[PDB]
Every structure is written in structure tokens, then in C-alpha cells.
UniProtKB/Swiss-Prot annotation:
8-oxo-dGMP binds at residues 6, 21, 31, 115-118. Its cofactor is Mg(2+). Monomer. This is Oxidized purine nucleoside triphosphate hydrolase. Keywords: Cytoplasm, Hydrolase, Magnesium, Metal-binding, Mitochondrion, Nucleus, RNA-binding, Transit peptide. 8-oxo-dGTP binds at residues 6, 21, 31, 33-36, 115-118. Changing residue 154 to A: Slightly reduces 2-oxo-dATPase and 8-oxo-dGTPase activities and increases thermolability. GO terms for cellular component: cytoplasm; cytosol; mitochondrial matrix; mitochondrion; nucleus. CDD domains: NUDIX_MTH1_Nudt1. It comes from Homo sapiens. Widely expressed with highest expression in thymus, testis, embryo and proliferating blood lymphocytes. Mg(2+) 1 binds at residues 34, 54, 98. Changing residue 115 to Y: Enhances 2-oxo-dATPase activity and greatly reduces 8-oxo-dGTPase activity. Residues 1-130 form the Nudix hydrolase domain.
Length: 154
């Protein structure tokens, strides 16, 4: 009972791009760029597509850095989120009716205004570590339990 999603982080040596979602699931929080994987499309092709649709950027090189499963108590579907980091990008981030992009210095990540799980696995992403995670949520603000382990292969 799971559904595939992608999440792409545009990470450069001194800064990371995040986008403030203006409506829908997760509105009001800074996040990477992603969404559901479609029929007939590979997970990586979906990550590339979602980055363009949501940020206006075109990614050359992409690589997998994590997989995180989210459970929301009372909701049947688990979110199976495949996390990617960019290595090269083209274009300028585009503000739209759906998303407001901003670059953040690496020591100024706005964790108070992000999903609470990001405080756990973003430090790994920043240090170029790969990870498998699982977070059980009650509502959208409370982590009931979690597991997070570094791995060599996502
Ligand atoms: N970055 C990020 N964290 C999340 N936690 C739960 C659901 C979606 C999420 N996107």
C-alpha cells in the first residue's frame, strides 16, 4: 500500500535551493521539488520532470541519495519518497502561483519552516551520505517514531 514520489534537492557547495509551497499538501513549508511518479515513467525520469515542472530548472546530472517512507496514521497509503541531489543545473528558478524559490546558505537552512523530519536527514544529505528512512506521523507536525540509517546503496 505505497505510492512512489520523488524529491530533488539542488545542492551546490555553499547553498541549497528550496521552494516555499503556496497551496496543497505541505503548503507553508520550504521543500525540495518533486511529486508523484507517473505510469510508464522511471523514478529518475519523474524526478527530472518534477524538477522542471516545479522550479523551471533543467537538470543535467542527477543522483540518488535516499529513500524515505512516510506513514500518516489513519491514511492507508504510504509515501515512498526517492530523494535525489543535482550535480549540474541550467536555468534560473521561476516563481509561480505554486512555488516561491529561494537559495539558502548551508548554515541558514530554515528547519523551523520545513517538515520536521528534514532536521534528521538533511545533515546526512549535506555531508554526501546516502540513507534509508522511515517516519511515522500523527497529523503534519508530530513524529511518533522513526528509523534512519546510512547505506552504501540507495
Ligand atoms: N522534505 C519533506 N519532508 C517530508 N515529510 C513528510 C512528507 C513530505 C515531506 N517532504
Amino acid at each position: 500500500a505505497s505510492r512512489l514520489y520523488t524529491l530533488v534537492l539542488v545542492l551546490q557547495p555553499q547553498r541549497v535551493l528550496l521552494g516555499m509551497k503556496k497551496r496543497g499538501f505541505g503548503a507553508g513549508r520550504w521543500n525540495g521539488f518533486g511529486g508523484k511518479v507517473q505510469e510508464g515513467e522511471t523514478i529518475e525520469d519523474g524526478a527530472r520532470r518534477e524538477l522542471q515542472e516545479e522550479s523551471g530548472l533543467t537538470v543535467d546530472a542527477l543522483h540518488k541519495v535516499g529513500q524515505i517512507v512516510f506513514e500518516f496514521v489513519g491514511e492507508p497509503e504510504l509515501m515512498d519518497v526517492h530523494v535525489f541531489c543535482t550535480d549540474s543545473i541550467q536555468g534560473t528558478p521561476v516563481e509561480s502561483d505554486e512555488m516561491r524559490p529561494c537559495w539558502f546558505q548551508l548554515d541558514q537552512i530554515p528547519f523551523k519552516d520545513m517538515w520536521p523530519d528534514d532536521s534528521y536527514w538533511f545533515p546526512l544529505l549535506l555531508q554526501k551520505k546516502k540513507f534509508h528512512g522511515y517516519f511515522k506521523f500523527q497529523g503534519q507536525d508530530t513524529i511518533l517514531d522513526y528509523t534512519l540509517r546510512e547505506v552504501d546503496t540507495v
